[PDB]
Amino acid sequence: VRERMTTQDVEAITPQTLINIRPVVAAIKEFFGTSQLSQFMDQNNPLSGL
DNA sequence: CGCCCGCTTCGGGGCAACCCTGCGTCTAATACAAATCCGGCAATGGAGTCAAGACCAGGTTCG
Ligand SMILES: C/C(=C\[C@H](C)CCCCC(=O)O)[C@@H]1O[C@@H]2C=C[C@@H]1OC(=O)\C=C/C=C\C=C\[C@H]1O[C@@H]3C[C@H]1O[C@@H](/C=C/C[C@H]1O[C@H](C[C@H](O)[C@H]1C)[C@@H](O)[C@@H](O)/C=C/CC/C=C/C2)[C@@H]3C
């Protein structure tokens, strides 16, 4: 946003144009898969999930 | 008696070898020439195929 605040022209831009959500959604998808703390639920008896 | 000056001794620095406190989207085409694929006839010419048809030789039948 701070980059394209300057390169864009004024009196034409909007928050729909300024905002790129793809690094945020890539950070979420890169956390939930392929991290240490996000593991498969160990279920072979209900004590193990707990 | 004091004094220089390199010899040894330790310090500090410097450096070489391993992990994560690591791990962004970008003008946009035109113009043209050469090379290459490929699609479709257009000569085949050699290689396979059918069929007749002849070739006797020795069992096989008949005299
Ligand atoms: C070594 C480790 C996790 C190991 C893979 C499993 C735990 C080892 C301890 C043990 O031997 O009991 C650390 O885990 C985390 C971050 C760093 C380390 O990961 C690491 O560095 C190693 C792997 C990190 C993420 C792996 C994700 C995916 O790999 C597959 C699918 C995803 O997860 C893995 C499965 C994990 C569940 C395990 O659960 C364990 C039993 C089995 O070993 C597994 C079913 C149970 O002990 C379970 O109750 C306990 C889990 C530990 C909780 C997380 C701690 C920190 C499966 C192999």
Token representation of residue A8: 């864009």
The answer to whether A8 and A17 are in contact (CB under 8 A) is: yes
What is the C-alpha to C-alpha distance for residues A49 and A29, in angstroms, rounded to an integer? 23
Enumerate residues near strand B (beta carbon within 7 A): A 3-4, 7, 20, 23
**A32-41 burial, b for 16+ CB within 10 Å, e for fewer?**
eeeeeeeeee
What is the C-alpha to C-alpha distance for residues A9 and A18, in angstroms, rounded to an integer? 11
Residues 6+ apart with CB under 8 A from A43: A49
Query: How were these coordinates obtained?
Result: cryo-EM
Q: What is the 3-state secondary structure (H, E, C) of A1-50?
A: CCCHHHHCCCCCCCHHHHCCCHHHHHHHHHHHCCCCCCCCCCCCCHHHHC
What is the C-alpha to C-alpha distance for residues A41 and A49, in angstroms, rounded to an integer? 6
Contact residues of ligand 1, CB 6 A cut-off: A 36, 39-40, 42
Q: Which amino acid is at A17?
A: T
